[PDB]
Amino acid sequence: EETRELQSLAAAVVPSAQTLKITDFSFSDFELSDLETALCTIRMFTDLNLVQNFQMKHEVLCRWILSVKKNYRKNVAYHNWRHAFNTAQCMFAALKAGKIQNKLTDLEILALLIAALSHDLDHRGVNNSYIQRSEHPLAQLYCHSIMEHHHFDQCLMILNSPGNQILSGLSIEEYKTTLKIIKQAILATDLALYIKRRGEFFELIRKNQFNLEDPHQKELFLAMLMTACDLSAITKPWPIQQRIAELVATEFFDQGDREKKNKIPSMQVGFIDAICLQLYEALTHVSEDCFPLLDGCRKNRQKWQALAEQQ
Ligand SMILES: [Mg+2]
Ligand SMILES: [Zn+2]
């Protein structure tokens, strides 16, 4: 923890969302410093009116952002702070440009932004087995989103750390509700759960029966939205997506955790067809203004497929 970094961040001016380009679905962070990503994150909380509605003190929000960033591992090629930051930025764009904000309560928005920023906390890389030391070595197949429970645990620890309590201003009831939504939001990032619930979502939509007013359906939508944001690197402009695919590959093969480009195109096409395309199609139906995520995903499939056919 750099007291210098905190002082620096807390005293800095925070440019507008438009100046920071965070309202753009095509947003990239390659040109940004860590400080710049922290400032963008402050703007996200501010423009979603979370700072006002829940009386967050500036220094506390600043300290919390820095604690979150610090608890991601910089030696992990893809699953690091930049991934979480980008997941949060997609959530912001989906709520604003995507116009999903007016469809949710203030607590759901608050929880979704916190969850997006915290969903992969302390990730050690996909090529590194997550070991649950608190369970028997022969009985470690809970598969009940074990790593995600760990990410949530990390999130709660930071939310409760001295000087980092950004939810201090909520009443006890609001606090319990918010924690519950954050927890379900983080667990939703387990792709296994996404695949398990995909069916309902797609069916409900197929029959114009999707009712966001239904508590069960709304919870379902929040889970789908988290997945859409977690996977959004797949919708980025071509040069950015190539870079992001490169990072994932590195973490997977070169043990960027703690044959290649040649196999990447086929792999991205497969992932787009098996998981991504349908999700963004469904999201666009919920909110047409989310179309650019779908457009971006389709454009990338064609680019990767072309390379797959070897140019
Ligand atoms: Mg994850
Ligand atoms: Zn993730």
Curated annotation (Swiss-Prot):
Protein residues bound to Mg(2+): 120
Binding site for 3',5'-cyclic GMP: 268
Impact reported for residue 233 to N: Changes substrate selectivity from cGMP-specific to dual cAMP and cGMP binding and hydrolysis
Annotated catalytic residues: 79
Highest rank taxon of the organism: Eukaryota
Modification after translation (UniProt): Phosphorylation is regulated by binding of cGMP to the two allosteric sites. Phosphorylation by PRKG1 leads to its activation.
PDEase domain residues: 2-311
Disulfide bonds listed in the record: none
Positions that bind Zn(2+): 83, 119-120, 230
Purpose: Plays a role in signal transduction by regulating the intracellular concentration of cyclic nucleotides. This phosphodiesterase catalyzes the specific hydrolysis of cGMP to 5'-GMP. Specifically regulates nitric-oxide-generated cGMP.
Family membership: Belongs to the cyclic nucleotide phosphodiesterase family.
Domain notes: Composed of a C-terminal catalytic domain containing two putative divalent metal sites and an N-terminal regulatory domain which contains two homologous allosteric cGMP-binding regions, A and B.
Name the UniProt record assigns to this protein: cGMP-specific 3',5'-cyclic phosphodiesterase
Lineage: Eukaryota, Metazoa, Chordata, Craniata, Vertebrata
